[PDB]
């Protein structure tokens, strides 16, 4: 076929019940995320050629960086909280990337401040057991899947993106070819 297993994609050994039927998962520290990001626009390209009725789950992982890899796990849960996601997604990832500003959960706070949420509704929610439940599942969306690397996306806890099979001379290419099998993948 066009698209087969090992190729654009690979199946779960053990497929995860009632998962986010489209599931990413990245971390501020991790260079293709970085990429996926702010280069390709993965997301947004998926997003556009989604059918009807589709959501899309965006989550952060801990297995890199540390302390401060838990700290930005915590505060994307902030962001999705607050529905923040796309005021915080590009300065986190250039502060701690490109910059190099972001050093202590302070200084991932200064990005929330300056992208305009105030300190108390940020303090708040930092500290509020809704976000304590919003870490516990990017954890446990991680821990159904295996997962041991960063990006990944996951379609109706069955099957994962492999992008290493697809060509990336051109970027637009890569961007659609992996949308495409996303779209492929989601009416399966």
């Given at each position: ?15 995860v ?5 489209v ?9 293709h995320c ?20 589709v ?17 930005l ?61 919003l870490?516990a599942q990017?954890?446990?969306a ?6 041991r ?8 806890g ?27 993948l989601?009416?399966?």
């Amino acid at each position: 076929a066009q698209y087969e297993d090992g190729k654009q994609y690979t199946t779960l050994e053990k497929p995860v019940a009632g998962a986010p039927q489209v599931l990413e998962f990245f971390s501020f520290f991790c260079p293709h995320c970085y990429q996926f990001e702010e280069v390709l626009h993965i997301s947004d390209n998926v997003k556009k050629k989604l059918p009807e009725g589709v959501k899309m789950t965006k989550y952060h992982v801990n297995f890199m960086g540390g302390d401060l890899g838990k700290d930005l796990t915590q505060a994307w849960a902030v962001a999705m909280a607050l529905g923040v996601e796309d005021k915080v997604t590009v300065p986190l990832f250039e502060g701690v990337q490109k910059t190099q500003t972001i050093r202590s959960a302070s200084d991932i706070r200064d990005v929330f401040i300056n992208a305009g949420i105030k300190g108390e509704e940020y303090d708040a929610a930092w500290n509020s057991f809704v976000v304590k439940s919003l870490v516990a599942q990017q954890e446990k969306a991680a821990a159904d899947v295996q997962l041991r690397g960063v990006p990944a996306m996951f379609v109706n806890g069955k099957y994962q993106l492999n992008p290493q099979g697809m060509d990336t001379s051109n970027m637009d290419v890569f961007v659609q070819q992996y949308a495409d099998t996303v779209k492929y993948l989601s009416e399966k």
